[PDB]
Structure formats: C-alpha cells, structure tokens
RNA sequence: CGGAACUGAGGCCAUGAUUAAGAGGGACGGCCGGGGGCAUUCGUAUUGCGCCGCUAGAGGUGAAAUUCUUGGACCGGCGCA
C-alpha cells in the first residue's frame, strides 16, 4: 500500500535534485524533505569508459 | 655775547599710515566624498566534526593514472566550530 490515498487523480509529489557538471551527472529523487531517498542514479554506472 | 649737557610751559603743519592683485595665509556658513584611525554588527561559501537515509562507484583528464572507496566514499538532510 504505497500511498494508499487512492483517487486516481491525487498526484504524489517528490523532488528530483539534478546535479549536473562536467565528468558526471546525478539524478537523486527524494520526498518533499530531502531526508528520504529513492534510487539515486548516475552516468558512470551505465557507460564503460571514463571519458563519456 | 657763542656752544655745549639738562630741564619747563606753548601757538604753528590741510598736522604723519598708498591701495587691496582673476598673488597668498587665516576666520565664517551650508554641504561633499569606496579619504584616515579605533571599537562594533551581518552575509553566503569553504574545510572539519556529529547524527539520519539510499546505494557502488567518486575525482581528474585531450586521454589516463597517482588518490578516495561496503571499516559505507560521492549525493541529499539538520546542527555545531
């Protein structure tokens, strides 16, 4: 029961927190507070070499 | 009689001081300014430290490595110095 307030229109908010720069890129979904995290992901966990 | 030193009272002179620098000094009035010294309050950032959460990479390069990394890095969060 993940957000059991079932109305099929009650949208559930989060925040994303993109940290972009050179040599990296992060995507860090969290709740409204930034205290609880949901699947932080990067660019280095997908490609093979370090210059891409 | 001359010229010496000294002391007293008087009338006379149209009776005596050049102006005030587009030279300067000082005074006075209202302002002006990241001018100078002493004490005072504020700011985000950085670095470290503590506690919480999820997860394998993070840095840095033209490209790499030295280096940090499940004994929990980098990211996010609240505090403190």
End-to-end CA distance of chain A: 40
Distance A22 CA to B58 C1' (A): 13
β-pair type (A18-21, A37-41): unpaired
Largest CA distance in chain A: 46
A23 touches strand B (CB under 7 A): yes
A18 touches strand B (CB under 7 A): no
> What technique determined this structure?
cryo-EM
Which bases in strand B are touched by protein, i.e. have an atom under 7 Å from a CB? 52-65, 75-78
Helix, strand, coil % over all residues of chain A, rounded to 5:
0, 35, 65
Distance CA A7, CA A18 (A): 30
Distance CA A45, CA A39 (A): 12
Distance of CA A12 to CAs A5, A9, A40, Å? 10, 9, 18
């Amino acid at each position: 029961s993940l957000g059991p307030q079932v109305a099929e229109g009650e949208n559930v908010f989060g925040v994303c927190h993109i940290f972009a720069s050179f040599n990296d890129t992060f995507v860090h979904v969290t709740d409204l507070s930034g205290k609880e995290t949901i699947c932080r992901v990067t660019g280095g966990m997908k490609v093979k070499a370090d210059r891409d």
